[PDB]
């Protein structure tokens, strides 16, 4: 495949519905070697089995809230991999009151801090910690949502963070770019995942996108996965600092009328 | 003038070079009543001199890092003003290492937290605390920079925060729009202010903009001030969720070639 | 007012619902001297009556399809006005089939050509023709629609033209900028005007914007007029190459959910 | 490869430097069957030599200025291929004066017409003529330049056309999307090609992008080609109405400082 011999580290794999699972599925198909992260202990078993499904024994704990676990992630990884060809940042979090109802009702300094700490900052943080072992033509990838560009109901505080996230894509790309490293994001359309359940009217978003997107259909983790594998590969060696929409074209229209 | 009888609260006035001072001059010229904030105690005297310069006795302390000072700002203001017609958010801060040199060099979890806390969160925080006394056609205004939209050298962590800020503009507009309140931003060009001294090689950006911007000239706080007065006034009652470029058109070109 | 002594030529005044009529009124209110254009002979009486309402006798024919009338427009104006301080391009046209139903169904080489000829080329065409008598800090203004940025139902071929138009703003601004001239556009929200009747299901868009826009209301030509007057004035001297949304914030959200 | 059994029609292949050659080059590698177009007779021999290099005998004349040749193109193709899985629009033209020096100096109603006729209209025009034989999951691709988004020196009238083109991408995606067809564009960075020679100071742009783009390097037709092959394949079935930047990240920075 077009990722032969590339070693890629995936975060955010939580279930077989997770976006990170779809990307994983595609990277494996195209010849990648995979390593995974998890947060919390009880999940050690499930992720090790996910890793086993993809022919990997390489699983590491990493709660991006802790500086210690981040540094420790790549110290451990260096003992297995001399270098890293790809990193996928598929992580997001917000206190549910901060992603439900009115934007201001759930706005607190503490909810703001956490959403940005976990959903935005953690990406260049992981980039910084991996830099000592990144290959010369490595590729970093994160996941964003249209909610950064425009105000979407219920997304609220999470839209602020993703705007910061998409900005870090551009700044990371400049910083790591001279070395030949690429940094991009996929702005995925709505997909039913564990995190999605935290969004109050998620079901309303799904039907609307299915109805109004140019392709008249929602996206799948297979579609996001192929797009991700592409950006992680040398096929996209001319592409960096990009926010690519894989949302059946929804971002480019005004639907509902 | 076109702000007659409008009561506007101004933050971020620190010197006669500050952007908030330019807006203040224009608002007063157009007939507004002004109130000002300061941070720290030692600054209590200077802002009063500036406040008197605009025919005002209304000064209140507000370090937007402290939840308490924010709430007290509008409780104290409420004893003087029945309602609030305009709010100007002219606040910015980042640890200087986070706005100097390489993006990752100055990237630390704590630098990220602070820049976003002060430069982004503080805007909707002030909006939420002010909400009880905002008029039907009140107008909130914040200041941004092109560094949120594209990667500009040295702007670094502040670019991430400014991206969140511009996103908060949109979500604020949706939340407060139903009540009739408008929320906008000016993406201002480079102005040599106290804050400007914190961005290393600020001088090259000024030279570059003066040379390559369509109008072949940098902008002034007089110009940004007039632009602010427009947005705070009933002249712009059809304008909300907007990021207005006041940078002699620089954002719209690829200069240097 | 803030247009004292400014001489402004307004095109596209056809009725008291026209956007150009709202702009004229705001410009007159703020102290400008006005001149108007019309297309065809029959309309000569109609515009002359409109010009009198604004204390003007300066009316000139100009069908922008004809190169001759454009050059002749500013030859005639020159005999009355030594210089021109503002020019408003409120012109648009396309065969109705090209702005009805499906995009491809109404696509013909000729429909494409005309839409772009009248709605796009005529703006920089008039700019070029006016330059010999434009003042040092003159201001050019055109009207666009969100249909340039994103695909809107039934707008179709007109969306292509508006994208060219918004591009012409940027290239014009660089071209005319060294002289000190500013060039901007207003992206107006839906307004019930004569041109509006050519957009099938215009009413559906009106209802949708009123329901989903942040301010929960459609805009008026008075709001667009004040915004236009601002951009034409020296209050906006730091503003060029800008496409400013005056649409109650509709552009910044994903409505319907 | 990942384009096995897909039949793709390529336009705009003129030399071994052409962008269309890089795409052809990638599509064949990935298992596609190719057919090509040429314009003028004199080039008939040359393109057949190219088509043979990619194992094809299918070559057809098509000057996209003539409605007749467009219709005839897909009539002839229909005799060899029952269906079409891919269409590549790699076509552009403008009078040399309209892409040289000042924007207004080279502006004529006629130069404008030609640039928009060939570089913009010709794309959805070909899409429409192909529609009767497009596969259900076929994929259309065009080439654009950053000059549509921002004002670039010397690009001038061509930037307007490319802006209309990028809009036609969005409206096409909606029109053809219900059928399952995808429409995208690649906004390519500078490539030294035959068309490139029409832009004064092409080299000045090359030097600047290599110096300021995040990857500190210009792009190649191989890189644009792989990106093109991706979008034409079912790997990007979740991607439509997209303008993908393949320019080493240049669009995302403010360079020169
Ligand atoms: N599913 C969608 O509709 C959708 C759409 C657009 C973007 N996204 C983005 O995709 C990414 C993945 O979300 P998903 O929908 O695939 O869901 P998911 O809920 O299965 O995954 C979210 C992941 O975040 C991880 N995470 C949360 N807090 C963490 C922390 N402190 N440290 C480490 N990991 C932490 C969890 O372990 C989990 O695997 C997120 O960034 C989300 O914003 C999702
Ligand atoms: N100067 C420029 O070129 C420029 C360009 C674009 C945007 N901006 C933005 O304009 C705004 C004002 O900057 P300026 O250039 O006028 O500068 P200035 O340095 O004179 O003012 C900055 C203000 O921030 C305030 N501030 C900092 N930390 C604070 C805190 N914790 N709590 C409360 N207030 C705090 C200071 O009191 C000061 O009044 C900022 O938001 C800045 O991002 C500036
Ligand atoms: N009404 C809206 O909802 C709306 C929204 C966004 C933008 N606009 C823009 O507003 C402008 C028109 O304002 P309006 O829509 O209120 O309409 P209007 O119908 O009153 O004006 C359209 C004008 O175009 C002029 N015109 C048409 N063909 C012409 C030609 N060949 N030569 C010269 N003039 C010609 C007509 O004389 C008329 O005055 C257009 O540029 C249109 O794109 C309108
Ligand atoms: N070269 C670059 O740096 C660059 C960058 C961005 C976008 N582009 C776009 O890429 C496309 C191809 O350009 P290129 O640089 O690969 O160059 P190229 O000059 O080799 O190809 C241009 C093609 O246009 C075709 N063409 C022109 N007029 C035509 C007509 N009337 N009918 C049919 N075909 C016609 C020619 O056959 C030729 O193959 C163009 O659309 C151009 O806008 C080029
Ligand atoms: C609306 C589509 C969408 C976007 C997400 O970022 C998303 O992921 C999160 C949402 C809120 C908080 C944390 C997330 F990871 C889930 C989702 F369904
Ligand atoms: C355009 C250059 C520029 C941008 C700013 O946002 C700016 O304002 C700040 C930047 C960093 C930290 C605090 C600021 F107020 C100052 C300045 F000179
Ligand atoms: C949908 C909102 C809208 C936008 C226009 O550009 C508009 O103006 C025109 C539309 C089609 C043809 C000519 C026009 F001036 C009218 C209108 F109602
Ligand atoms: C500056 C990058 C660039 C863009 C083009 O569209 C391009 O192709 C053309 C340029 C002008 C006129 C017709 C073209 F096809 C060549 C080129 F070098």
**CATH number of the domain residue A120 falls in:** 3.40.50.720
C165 lines ligand 3 (CB under 6 A): no
Q: How many CB atoms lie within 10 A of CB D42?
A: 8
A190 lines ligand 5 (CB under 6 A): yes
Which residues of chain C make contact with A257, given a CB cutoff of 8 A? 152-153, 201, 204-205, 207-208
Which residues of chain C make contact with A100, given a CB cutoff of 8 A? none
Q: How far is CA D152 from CA B114, B254, C175, in A?
A: 37, 5, 11
Residue D224 among known ligand-binding residues: no
Q: How far is CA C89 from the centre of its chain?
A: 4
Secondary structure of D1-33 as H, E, C letters: CCCCCCEEEECCCCCCCCHHHHHHHHHHHCCCE
Q: How far is CA A165 from CA A99, A144, A170, A241, in A?
A: 17, 7, 9, 12
User: What's this structure's resolution in Å?
Assistant: 2.7
Bridge partners of D185?
D142, D243
> A243: closest CA among B151, D220, C256, D155?
B151
HSE, side-chain direction, 13 A CA sphere, residue A43? 16
C107: nearest CA partner in chain D: D125
Give B70→chain C minimum CA distance, Å: 26
> D27: closest CA among D91, D86, D89, D90?
D86
Q: Which residues in A30-133 belong to E strands, given as ranges?
A: 33-38, 59-61, 84-89
Q: Which residues in chain D belong to E strands, given as ranges?
A: 7-10, 33-38, 59-61, 84-89, 134-144, 182-188, 242-246
Cβ-Cβ contacts under 8 Å for A157 (sequence gap 6 or more): A94, A98, A99, A103, A106, A107, A111, A112, A115, B171
Q: Tokens standing for A64? A: 């991006």
C188 lines ligand 3 (CB under 6 A): yes
> A153: closest CA among A102, A107, A220?
A102
Of C38, C61, C92, the one to substitute when testing ligand 3's pocket (max ligand atoms within 8 A of C-beta) is: C92
Q: Tokens standing for A159? A: 């839209």
β-strand pairing of B7-10 with B84-89: parallel
> B159: closest CA among B98, B97, B234?
B98
CB A172 within 8 A of CB A128: no
Question: Which chains have at least 3 CB atom pairs separated by less than 8 Å from chain B?
Answer: A, C, D
> C146: closest CA among C215, C239, C227, C243?
C243
Q: Tokens standing for B173? A: 């507009």
Distance CA B222, CA D107 (A): 35
Which of the following is catalytic: B38, B121, B155, B171?
Answer: B155
Of D39, D89, D92, the one to substitute when testing ligand 8's pocket (max ligand atoms within 8 A of C-beta) is: D92
Q: How far is CA D225 from the centre of its chain?
A: 11
Look at phi and psi of residue B179 and say left if phi exceeds 0, alpha if psi is from -120 to 50, else beta.
alpha
Domain span including residue C110: 1-257
A190: nearest CA partner in chain D: D238
Bridge partners of C140?
C87, C183
B203: nearest CA partner in chain D: D257
Q: How far is CA D129 from the centre of its chain?
A: 17
Q: Tokens standing for B235? A: 């002249």
Distance CA C50, CA C37 (A): 11
> D157: closest CA among B62, B140, C168?
C168
Cβ-Cβ contacts under 8 Å for D18 (sequence gap 6 or more): D12, D90, D193, D194, D221
Active-site amino acid positions of D: 145, 155
The count of structural domains within chain D is 1
Distance CA D144, CA D119 (A): 9
Q: How many CB atoms lie within 10 A of CB B82?
A: 8
Q: Tokens standing for B38? A: 């300061």
Answer yes or no: C21 catalytic.
Answer: no
End-to-end Cα separation, chain D, in angstroms: 43
Question: Which chains have at least 3 CB atom pairs separated by less than 8 Å from chain D?
Answer: A, B, C
Q: Sheet containing D33-38: give its strands across.
A: D59-61, D33-38, D7-10, D84-89, D134-144, D182-188, D242-246
CB A142 within 8 A of CB A163: no
Give B125→chain C minimum CA distance, Å: 19
Bridge partners of B151?
D253
């Amino acid at each position: 495949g077009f990722l032969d011999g590339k070693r890629i580290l995936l975060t955010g794999l939580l279930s077989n519905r997770s976006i990170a699972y779809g990307i994983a599925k595609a990277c494996k198909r195209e010849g990648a070697e995979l390593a995974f992260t998890y947060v919390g202990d009880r999940f050690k078993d499930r992720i090790t089995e996910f890793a086993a499904e993809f022919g990997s024994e390489l699983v590491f704990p990493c709660d991006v809230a802790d500086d210690a676990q981040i540094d420790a992630l790549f110290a451990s990884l260096k003992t297995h991999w001399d270098s890293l060809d790809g990193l996928v940042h598929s992580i997001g979090f917000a206190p549910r009151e901060a992603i439900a109802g009115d934007f201001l009702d759930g706005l607190t300094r503490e909810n703001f801090r956490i959403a940005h700490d976990i959903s935005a900052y953690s990406f260049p943080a992981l980039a910084k910690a991996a830099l000592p072992m990144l290959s010369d033509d490595a590729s970093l990838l994160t996941l964003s949502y249209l909610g950064a560009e425009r105000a979407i109901p219920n997304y609220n505080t999470m839209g602020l963070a993703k705007a910061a996230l998409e900005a870090s894509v551009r700044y990371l790309a400049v910083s790591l770019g001279a070395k030949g490293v690429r940094v991009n994001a996929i702005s995925a359309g709505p997909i039913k995942t564990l995190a999605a359940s935290g969004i109050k009217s998620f079901g309303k978003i799904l039907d609307f996108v299915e109805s109004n997107s140019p392709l008249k259909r929602n996206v799948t983790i297979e579609q996001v996965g192929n797009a991700g594998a592409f950006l992680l590969s040398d096929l996209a060696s001319g592409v960096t600092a990009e926010v690519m929409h894989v949302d059946s074209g929804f971002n480019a229209v005004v639907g509902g009328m």
